Amino acid sequence: SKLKPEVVEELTRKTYFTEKEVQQWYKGFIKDCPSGQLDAAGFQKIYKQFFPFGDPTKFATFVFNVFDENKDGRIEFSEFIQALSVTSRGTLDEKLRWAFKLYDLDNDGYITRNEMLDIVDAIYQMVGNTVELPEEENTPEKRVDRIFAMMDKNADGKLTLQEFQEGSKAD
């Protein structure tokens, strides 16, 4: 697990990680994925190990496809470390820009309510829902109806990145 100096340097410049951290993450990545290429089954396995009695298939597939920047069916280390940099160390706006890419499942530049429901449902399928009374059931649908309407300031049935990024931000 020896990363070529130029590569380390470039990945360090492109992320929030120090050169030491990049090399440490590489060493762990190669230990877990000796070929340097994480496939979709291995990615879902990680999440099943987190939630062995939820169903992580949908969430893992959605996130894998966003992480797989060159869409070759594999997460290479450059994709691994850049995905980790943004999702773990980005500013709030950078993290929400990444999430917008995840939620915009058809890549048309907007989040529609069906897309928000797909991600939210995927999250509940994996991690579960909060137990409530049958009369106050924690359904993805009613949660999405609330948040989406709140974000859709111009009520055109679609969310721009601007509308999405302002969703928890206080004014």
Partner: peptide, 28 residues
């Protein structure tokens, strides 16, 4: 109790946190 960050489900932050935790497990 309820997981801390599931209040952000649908806002983007929950998906981001869960994505990061999976990557971290993949590198440890």
């Amino acid at each position: 109790s309820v997981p801390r960050f599931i209040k952000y489900t649908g806002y983007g932050n929950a998906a981001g946190l869960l994505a990061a935790r999976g990557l971290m497990a993949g590198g440890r």
